Enzyme design. Structure first.
Site, PDB file in Angstrom:
ATOM      1  CG  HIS A   1      -3.685 -18.056 -11.511  1.00 12.25           C
ATOM      2  ND1 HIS A   1      -3.980 -18.622 -10.924  1.00 12.25           N
ATOM      3  CD2 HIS A   1      -3.915 -17.696 -12.649  1.00 12.25           C
ATOM      4  CE1 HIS A   1      -4.303 -20.186 -11.227  1.00 12.25           C
ATOM      5  NE2 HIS A   1      -4.216 -19.469 -13.098  1.00 12.25           N
TER       6      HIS A   1
ATOM      7  CG  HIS B   1      -9.217 -26.717 -18.809  1.00  8.35           C
ATOM      8  ND1 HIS B   1      -9.329 -26.712 -17.772  1.00  8.35           N
ATOM      9  CD2 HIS B   1      -8.342 -25.069 -19.087  1.00  8.35           C
ATOM     10  CE1 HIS B   1      -8.080 -25.688 -17.290  1.00  8.35           C
ATOM     11  NE2 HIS B   1      -7.604 -24.952 -18.217  1.00  8.35           N
TER      12      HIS B   1
ATOM     13  CD  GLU C   1      -9.977 -23.066 -15.502  1.00  8.43           C
ATOM     14  OE1 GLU C   1      -8.851 -21.302 -15.140  1.00  8.43           O
ATOM     15  OE2 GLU C   1      -9.187 -23.269 -14.711  1.00  8.43           O
TER      16      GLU C   1
ATOM     17  NE  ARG D   1      -7.233 -19.214 -16.313  1.00  9.56           N
ATOM     18  CZ  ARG D   1      -6.452 -18.151 -16.627  1.00  9.56           C
ATOM     19  NH1 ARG D   1      -6.983 -16.930 -16.613  1.00  9.56           N
ATOM     20  NH2 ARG D   1      -5.149 -18.725 -15.822  1.00  9.56           N
TER      21      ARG D   1
ATOM     22  CE1 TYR E   1      -7.973 -21.283 -18.999  1.00  9.24           C
ATOM     23  CE2 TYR E   1      -6.407 -20.968 -21.054  1.00  9.24           C
ATOM     24  CZ  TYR E   1      -6.796 -21.468 -19.869  1.00  9.24           C
ATOM     25  OH  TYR E   1      -5.709 -21.073 -18.994  1.00  9.24           O
TER      26      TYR E   1
ATOM     27  CG  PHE F   1      -7.814 -19.666  -9.539  1.00  5.90           C
ATOM     28  CD1 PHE F   1      -8.022 -18.404 -10.770  1.00  5.90           C
ATOM     29  CD2 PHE F   1      -7.657 -21.081  -9.706  1.00  5.90           C
ATOM     30  CE1 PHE F   1      -7.156 -18.718 -12.168  1.00  5.90           C
ATOM     31  CE2 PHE F   1      -7.114 -21.181 -11.022  1.00  5.90           C
ATOM     32  CZ  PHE F   1      -7.922 -20.218 -12.018  1.00  5.90           C
TER      33      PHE F   1
HETATM   34  N1  LIG Z   1      -5.747 -23.877  -9.120  1.00 10.66           N
HETATM   35  C1  LIG Z   1      -6.406 -24.995  -9.582  1.00 10.66           C
HETATM   36  N2  LIG Z   1      -6.403 -24.749 -11.322  1.00 10.66           N
HETATM   37  C2  LIG Z   1      -6.889 -25.580 -11.860  1.00 10.66           C
HETATM   38  C3  LIG Z   1      -8.940 -25.878 -10.707  1.00 10.66           C
HETATM   39  N3  LIG Z   1      -8.800 -26.662 -12.190  1.00 10.66           N
HETATM   40  C4  LIG Z   1      -8.204 -27.003 -12.761  1.00 10.66           C
HETATM   41  N4  LIG Z   1      -6.773 -26.199 -12.481  1.00 10.66           N
HETATM   42  C5  LIG Z   1      -5.663 -26.502 -13.866  1.00 10.66           C
HETATM   43  O1  LIG Z   1      -4.828 -27.170 -13.514  1.00 10.66           O
HETATM   44  C6  LIG Z   1      -3.961 -26.660 -12.961  1.00 10.66           C
HETATM   45  C7  LIG Z   1      -3.177 -26.603 -11.334  1.00 10.66           C
HETATM   46  O2  LIG Z   1      -3.458 -25.522 -10.278  1.00 10.66           O
HETATM   47  C8  LIG Z   1      -3.381 -25.913 -13.675  1.00 10.66           C
HETATM   48  O3  LIG Z   1      -3.456 -26.669 -15.395  1.00 10.66           O
HETATM   49  C9  LIG Z   1      -4.644 -25.144 -13.363  1.00 10.66           C
HETATM   50  O4  LIG Z   1      -4.838 -24.733 -15.086  1.00 10.66           O
HETATM   51  P1  LIG Z   1      -5.585 -23.179 -15.774  1.00 10.66           P
HETATM   52  O5  LIG Z   1      -4.530 -21.877 -14.790  1.00 10.66           O
HETATM   53  O6  LIG Z   1      -6.275 -23.157 -16.837  1.00 10.66           O
HETATM   54  O7  LIG Z   1      -6.778 -22.782 -14.204  1.00 10.66           O
HETATM   55  C10 LIG Z   1      -8.836 -25.555  -9.821  1.00 10.66           C
HETATM   56  O8  LIG Z   1      -9.625 -26.321  -9.224  1.00 10.66           O
HETATM   57  N5  LIG Z   1      -7.727 -24.825  -9.232  1.00 10.66           N
END
Ligand SMILES: Nc1nc2c(ncn2[C@@H]2O[C@H](CO)[C@@H](O)[C@H]2OP(=O)(O)O)c(=O)[nH]1
Ligand SMILES: [Ca+2]
Length: 104
Positions: free
Chosen positions: A92, A40, A58, A77, A38, A100
């Site tokens: 989440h 990212h 995020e 986040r 993070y 999300f």
């Molecule tokens: N659900 C979701 N996850 C994201 C998105 N962009 C990046 N991610 C990351 O992509 C993977 C699958 O959801 C996870 O590694 C999540 O990490 P974080 O828990 O850090 O968000 C997004 O737009 N939606």
């Protein structure tokens, strides 16, 4: 009252801006923290209708009130863009899998 409610977590605008500032700074310096690196990119697979333009990043916001420094990021986040503009606060909690939903 909460400015943002993520499940049972209650955040004020001050909590958010404090988290965002830390995240943006790291982003600016090209540094990351934690196993998930993070801050990212946030791809917005959810298709939230953010009022500011991408790219989005995020960074975890913690219910403890502490700034994220590693370890478990919890479920919440803050999402900011290249201009350090706040896009939204997401979680989440209440969403299936690693999806999300927006904090209210
Ligand atoms: N659900 C979701 N996850 C994201 C998105 N962009 C990046 N991610 C990351 O992509 C993977 C699958 O959801 C996870 O590694 C999540 O990490 P974080 O828990 O850090 O968000 C997004 O737009 N939606
Ligand atoms: Ca607080």
């Amino acid at each position: 009252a909460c400015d943002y409610t993520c499940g049972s977590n209650c955040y004020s605008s001050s909590d958010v801006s404090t988290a965002q500032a830390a995240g943006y700074k790291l982003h600016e310096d090209g540094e990351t923290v934690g196993s998930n690196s993070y801050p990212h990119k946030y791809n917005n697979y959810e298709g939230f209708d953010f009022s500011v333009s991408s790219p989005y990043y995020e960074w975890p916001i913690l219910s403890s009130g502490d700034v994220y420094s590693g370890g478990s990021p919890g479920a919440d986040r803050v999402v900011f863009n290249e201009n350090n503009q706040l896009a939204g606060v997401i979680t989440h909690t209440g969403a299936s899998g690693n999806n999300f939903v927006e904090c209210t």
